[PDB]
Amino acid sequence: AATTVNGGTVHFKGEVVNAACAVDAGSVDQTVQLGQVRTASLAQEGATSSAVGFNIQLNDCDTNVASKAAVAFLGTAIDAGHTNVLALQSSAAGSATNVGVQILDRTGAALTLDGATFSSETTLNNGTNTIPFQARYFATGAATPGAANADATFKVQYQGGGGGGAATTVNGGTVHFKGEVVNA
């Protein structure tokens, strides 16, 4: 049993209420727990954690509106030279330093934190779909232990409604990257 929706066709139309799929509660506001990471793996620019695959569960997809979906991500950039990488959160004086989060499409290519840098077009289907992603902590130098939390949002660029492109970039949900770094 679908077991979804409050009771009515979406009786709230403030904004761009066009999302082909309604995004599961278990995916809109997801806490991606990357766990503790060793500072060993975070010691030069380009060093990375073990990484983790997270996905976006899109319920009651319609293919008339959009036979496809992309996502984009947005957060505080760790630095100017790293507009691809999140700045953690909380204690900017007690979390880890020289490390941030990244988000990669399913191919493994690092997405940019502009909220409009779309990613790997998952051809959808009627019913239920999931776009997988990867995430991992990226060091920009000699990283340190402490805490490693961040909170992006993600967006959903639907597309594939006719003509040849036809795209709609709605919001998508919160991505609470949680985890920490330990001094090995």
What amino acid occupies position 21?
A: C
Helices (H) and strands (E) in the chain, counts: 1, 9
Q: Is the dihedral of CA 136, 55, 89, 157 positive or negative?
A: positive
Domains and CATH numbers, the chain: 1-184 (2.60.40.1090)
- Which pair of tokens denotes residue 89? 């959160």
Q: How many Cα atoms occupy the beta-carbon half-sphere of 104 within 13 Å?
A: 14
Q: How far apart are CA 86 and CA 167, in angstroms?
A: 26
Under 8 Å between Cβ of 84 and 113: yes
H helices present in 19-147, as ranges: 25-28
If one counts every other C-beta atom within 10 angstroms of the C-beta of residue 85, the result is: 25
Q: Which amino acid is at 16?
A: V
Q: Measured between alpha carbons, how far is 29 from 107 in angstroms, rounded to an integer?
A: 23
Q: Are 36 and 180 in contact (CB under 8 A)?
A: yes
What tokens were used for 8? Answer: 């009515």
The two structure tokens encoding residue 169: 């970039």
Query: Residue written as tokens 């077009």?
Result: 121
Neighbouring C-beta atoms of residue 9, cutoff 10 Å: 5
Under 8 Å CB-to-CB from 8, ≥6 apart: which residues?
Answer: none
Owner of token pair 């991505």? 175
E strands in 24-141? 29-38, 45-48, 52-61, 68-74, 99-105, 122-123, 127-140
Distance CA 179, CA 21 (A): 29
Residues contacting 52, CB < 8 A, separation 6+: 32, 34, 35, 134, 135, 136
Cα–Cα distances in angstroms (integers) from residue 167 to residues 4, 21, 41, 84, 85, in the given order: 26, 14, 39, 23, 26
Q: HSE on the CB side for 92, CA within 13 Å? A: 7
Exposed e or buried b for every residue in 165-184, given b needs 16+ CB within 10 A?
Answer: eeebbebbbebebbbbbeee
Alpha helices in the chain (DSSP H): 25-28
**Phi, psi at residue 108, to the nearest 5°?**
105, 5
Q: Which residue has the tokens 């100017």?
A: 80
Beta bridge partners of 78: none
Q: Six-digit token pair at 40? A: 């060993």
* Residue 113 DSSP one-character state: B
Task: Specify whether the CB–CB gap between 37 and 138 falls below 8 A.
Answer: no
